[PDB]
Write a protein that binds this ligand. Structure first.
Ligand SMILES: O[C@@]1(CNc2ncnc3[nH]ccc23)CCC[C@@H](C(F)(F)F)C1
Ligand SMILES: [Cl-]
Length: 167
């Protein structure tokens, strides 16, 4: 039993809710919140920009030190950093950004990072400003993640379409 509330159950382990992931994380304080990161951990917009703003830019400061030490992530890769005031940990995961021409096949690799964590709060990877089809992203999530994932979908119109089209 965990403290996530109001989610629809898609599968044994995948759960979905119309919610602002920032407000969800502040309420639940999960062990792991997933960020829709880029390889540079530049958290300018989308989910990443919103999560960073909620940390008063502390996420960006930590991220800049990480990059200065380790260099950029791989597309499809991840790193674990602090969750600041939002969660114990933030798993920064880089899904392909279609608006940069990045291979959508790397989306499965991106979701595989979730399997290293027993429970996660997460957005749909490569959705929103990353330019992929969120219906496809949900399918890859369900077919790749085996651990317990609680998906927050900010857009109510998108949330309703994802449920009604889910096979
Ligand atoms: O959930 C989506 C990712 N973005 C977010 N998800 C959850 N909390 C959030 N807070 C701020 C941003 C955000 C999935 C792709 C479409 C995207 C869009 F807004 F464009 F419709 C919504
Ligand atoms: Cl977005």
């Amino acid at each position: 039993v965990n403290s996530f509330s109001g989610y629809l159950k898609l599968t044994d382990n995948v759960y979905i809710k119309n919610a602002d992931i920032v407000e969800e994380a502040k309420k639940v304080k999960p062990t792991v919140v997933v960020n829709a990161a880029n390889v540079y951990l530049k958290h300018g917009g989308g989910v990443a920009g919103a999560l960073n703003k909620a940390t008063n830019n502390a996420m960006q400061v930590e991220s800049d030190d990480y990059i200065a030490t380790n260099g950029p992530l791989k597309v499809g890769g991840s790193c674990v950093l602090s969750g600041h005031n939002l969660a114990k940990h933030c798993l920064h995961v880089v899904g392909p950004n279609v608006n940069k021409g990045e291979d959508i096949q790397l989306l499965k690799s991106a979701y595989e990072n979730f399997n290293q964590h027993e429970v996660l709060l997460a957005p749909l990877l490569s959705a929103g400003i990353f330019g992929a089809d969120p219906i496809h992203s949900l399918r890859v999530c369900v077919d790749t993640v085996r651990t317990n994932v609680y998906l927050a979908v900010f857009d109510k119109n998108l949330y309703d379409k994802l449920v009604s089209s889910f096979l």
